């Protein structure tokens, strides 16, 4: 009609599905849309985890110059947090929004129109009998008008992604129920309903389009039917229940899973991989505990009773972490009066940024696997720098992002997204040994995570890239340290973070040599030996953490750590997983 | 009469030996094991020590006993033809007592379980079970013999007798005439602090003699006994064998109350003088190998140990000066610093189980005429001298032996790695070493089994052993990983002391894996490193 292009300021509640085949890039093209999206359709403000799915039975550097050369939008882009969106709650419970522009379908008629679509691609792949699908949902605040509109543009968004590759569907909009059977558009109309959106500067792409768009569905066909869209959806918005739908997404979801148990003897989780991103690679939830290496520059440079940073000191012990087998480096530092009047200091930043600059020259300088860097600050100014000159890779933050939650915006940029850690603690080291009255210590702490999870959501920080720490030895009783442990099972859908390394919890298990702590300054024989039992406490929980399949650890001792998860991780690779059986049965018989 | 007819006999009984003192279960079970060895017979098995729910005179007692008039051979045994008679019913010679039949076995039984189980209305048990090949006449004779053996330890204990033969019998109102209890005692034993006294308390009772005994297929703790011992065997009197009598037991109970009879019943080894619960405590066992070296540093190494937290030493001084020179005045040593630091006399508790690592008959002889060791390591299951086992008993004393699976010696070893079915070979070599222990009278509870890590294994072999270790859930387990080629071999490449800490830290991870496996005892050099991650992984478990 006029009223796809009658400007009047809507907002609408999109949810998309995006996926890729390309499983080497599935991150970079799939974070690539994630910023065509926030960039031409509104704001993404929910994601799902990402995900390697097995179905019911290229050269990059076109992405990175296509990143320069875009096309403005002709909405504003606005980084602001937000704490709620109303739209969003009214969405999710079907309060009264406005009539579809478009016009719509009742139930029945949807149904059956989805399922002759359904009947009609199974049929067709019968014939066809003549591969890894990652997937990732994403809730929209948008101001296209409608979904045919908002159709246009994803169309449009896949053909500047190709120089299937990108895959980006509508599943939801609104309370719509949609059907649209013959569409063709004529080649003004998509440029108009595009030139209501975007600056258009071109012409190649717009009749690749016109035979491209047969049919709209809303709800999406495979909605209901496709487990690997249930699947994200499920993180995303389980209360949600749609008119075309039977029950809510979670209880959809849960019976998907259950009957393909009951009645194929699947477990349909198996072959479908929860993934969480560190920095630009896919990493599988709970598949490898990955080593941290603590680097303290306080700690590296005046523990000696010395009054100067030495950042060559401690570039150096970063690379002997990388040669010790850590993963990541976490980097830290604090503002530090060092003499006995505490007034002349040296700056957090000061302590940091230099050391990280010479690693990164130090590092270029080899040619002849880079370490993911993790910054451990809860400072905006220090993140920035960081970021802005290419030296860390995740914020490791203490407070959760709660000392100053403008810090999230650093975390996305036009072209590039950053991993986070989220902490719990209470207080600050000098108060926190008392703030230890919990009324549900396990539940408290991981609900206070995931509230901090879908604030950071909320505002677009995606799912996937976020890890949790319940923060060992922060406002917690050595026993309560112990029971977070005992209970570490509460986050075994979760990427899971801790820090046990050299706590005081650690002597507190110990009752009535080739040495792990390597000193400082001389300490005397009781102290050593207390030493290096925590050092070896600690790689019992290295093998605890192990067993459950901790995502990543923080430690200190890197060579230790490594030896123990080499030797465990050998103990568990199971050449034949029935010979225990069969070899059994052999000797029986002979 | 014919009761004591001179004819020589030889025949087998199975016996149950039963009492309620945890504190002292062992000396006294154990006691009543030597008082079998002297006055019954030879022990030719031997099941595990249980735990169920339904003493300095002691020592005395064995300075001044009687003698037998039977004679006490040691030599080893490869075979009992009346055993193996036994085991599968073959025929034997009549009763001298009179029988009955299955259907008045049965009707006198139900009349003396019921009439017990009216006795209610009107907590702790060890049990053991033993074969003994026995030169008692019959079973009448051998009850008095064994009630003789209650009083002179004596409510402490009970020793009933659960078979003979293939013999049906149920006599009762017992009356044995004053003159005849000491008549056949006289016929075993050289009768010369007790007089005749004794033998007014055994007037009294034997009241009647059932066999099997009536409780034989009625209490779990004797099914549990004899399932070690003789799962085949199937008495005329019994439904079925042994194995299934106890597997129906054990469903009936699960599938009638969801008991899961097992939680209250626990099987026990002993590694010195007390009780181990299998499967609930992983014992550190620290290394001292002499071959360090200077007699006092060595001991004060094995000192360093104990606080560090091994409840074992193992020493060795074999892998010039002779193995016996190396070790044994060591241990000399250690026994006077030990005896000296009796100025805390209340930490008696407090010494370390010792064991030795040899071979040599030689060594082991002087250890244990000298009170040096109480457990025998022998990395060849005794093979190379079995007269060795010989030395595993004396009168009063029975040690505990650890036997090791390895092929060739120390330059062969490498060479020989090749294996049928390389898990269950091993674990079925370590079964035939214990077969042939406990047919020579080792009580089977004494037996821990070790799969010799690195000793003819490639280190793909040692590693596959260690993921399939859930075969010795059944029995006490005890292995050797400490600073062995295989570790090193797991760590991912990416000098000298670099290696030697990772190999360290790599048997950690091993630690933590025993320590989830439930292995009984590990065998390491790293003393305090290992009970801190013992101490670690024990906490988080407790809640
Ligand atoms: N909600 C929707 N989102 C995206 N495409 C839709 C939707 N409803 C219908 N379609 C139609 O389906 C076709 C899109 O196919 P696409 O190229 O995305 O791969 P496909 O898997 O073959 O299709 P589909 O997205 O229907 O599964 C187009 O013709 C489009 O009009
Ligand atoms: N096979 C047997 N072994 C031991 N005692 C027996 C046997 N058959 C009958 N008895 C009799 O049972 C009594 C054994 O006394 P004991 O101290 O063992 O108490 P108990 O355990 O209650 O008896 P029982 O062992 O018969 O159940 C004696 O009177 C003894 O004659
Ligand atoms: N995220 C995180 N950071 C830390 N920084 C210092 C000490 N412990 C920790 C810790 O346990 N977790
Ligand atoms: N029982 C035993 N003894 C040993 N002696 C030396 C080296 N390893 C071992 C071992 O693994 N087990
Ligand atoms: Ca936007
Ligand atoms: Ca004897
Ligand atoms: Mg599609
Ligand atoms: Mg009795």
Redesign the pocket.
Same mark, same amino acid.
């Given at each position: 009609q006029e009223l796809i292009l009658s400007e009047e300021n809507k907002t609408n509640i999109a949810v998309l599905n995006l996926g890729t085949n390309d499983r080497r890039n599935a991150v970079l093209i799939l974070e690539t849309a994630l910023h065509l999206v926030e960039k031409y359709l509104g704001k993404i403000i929910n994601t799902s985890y990402l995900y390697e799915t097995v179905p019911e039975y290229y050269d990059v550097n076109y992405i990175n110059e296509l990143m320069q050369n875009l096309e403005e939008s002709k909405y504003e882009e606005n980084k602001e947090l937000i704490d709620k969106c109303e739209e969003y709650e009214t969405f999710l419970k079907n309060g009264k929004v406005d009539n579809s522009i478009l016009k719509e379908v009742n139930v029945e008629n949807y149904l059956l129109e989805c399922n002759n679509?359904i009947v009609k691609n199974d049929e067709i792949m019968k014939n066809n009998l003549s591969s890894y699908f990652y997937n990732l949902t994403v809730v929209v605040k948008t101001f296209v008008n409608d979904?045919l509109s908002m159709?246009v543009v /994803?169309k449009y968004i896949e053909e500047l992604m190709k120089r299937?590759i990108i895959? /980006?569907?509508? #599943?939801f909009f609104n309370d719509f129920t949609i059907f649209m059977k013959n /569409?063709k558009l004529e080649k003004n109309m998509i440029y108009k309903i595009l030139s209501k959106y975007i600056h258009l500067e071109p012409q190649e792409i717009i009749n690749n389009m016109v035979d491209?768009?047969?049919? #709209?569905?809303?709800?999406?066909?495979?909605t209901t039917h496709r487990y690997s869209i249930l699947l994200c959806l499920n993180d995303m918005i389980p209360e949600y229940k749609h008119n075309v739908l039977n029950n809510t997404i979670r209880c959809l979801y849960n019976k998907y899973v259950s009957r393909m148990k009951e009645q194929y003897n699947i477990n349909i989780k198996e072959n479908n991989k929860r993934i969480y991103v560190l920095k630009d690679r896919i990493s599988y939830l709970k598949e490898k505990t990955n080593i941290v290496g603590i680097l303290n520059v306080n700690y590296d440079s005046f523990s000696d009773g010395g009054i100067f940073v030495e950042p060559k000191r401690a570039v150096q012990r970063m690379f002997e972490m990388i040669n010790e087998g850590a993963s990541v480096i976490d980097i830290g530092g604090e503002s530090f009066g060092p003499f006995v009047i505490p007034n002349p200091k040296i700056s957090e930043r000061d302590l940091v940024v230099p050391v990280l600059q010479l690693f990164q020259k130090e590092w270029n300088d080899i040619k002849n696997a880079k370490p993911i860097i993790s910054i451990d600050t809860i400072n905006y100014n220090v993140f920035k720098e960081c970021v802005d000159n290419d030296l860390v890779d995740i914020l490791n933050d203490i407070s959760a992002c709660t000392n100053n939650p403008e810090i999230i915006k650093l975390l996305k940029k036009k072209n590039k997204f950053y991993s986070v850690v989220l902490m719990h603690k209470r207080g600050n080291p000098h108060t926190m040994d008392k703030l230890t009255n919990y009324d549900n210590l396990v539940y408290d702490i991981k609900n206070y995570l995931e509230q901090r999870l879908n604030f950071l959501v909320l505002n677009g920080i995606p799912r996937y890239r976020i890890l949790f720490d319940i923060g060992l030895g922060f406002a917690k009783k050595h026993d309560q340290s112990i029971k977070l442990l005992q209970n570490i099972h509460v986050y075994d859908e979760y990427p899971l973070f801790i820090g046990y390394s050299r706590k005081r919890f650690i002597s507190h298990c110990m009752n009535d040599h080739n040495w792990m702590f390597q000193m400082n300054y001389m300490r005397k024989d009781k102290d050593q030996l207390l030493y290096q039992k925590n050092i070896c406490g600690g790689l019992a929980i290295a093998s605890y953490s192990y067993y459950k399949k901790v995502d990543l650890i923080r430690v200190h001792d890197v060579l230790e750590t490594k030896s123990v998860l080499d030797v465990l991780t050998k103990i568990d690779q199971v050449k034949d997983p029935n010979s225990s059986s069969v070899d059994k049965l052999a000797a029986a018989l002979e």
């Open positions: 679509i979904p159709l /994803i299937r895959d /980006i569907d509508i #599943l /569409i491209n768009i047969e049919f #709209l569905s809303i709800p999406h066909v495979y």
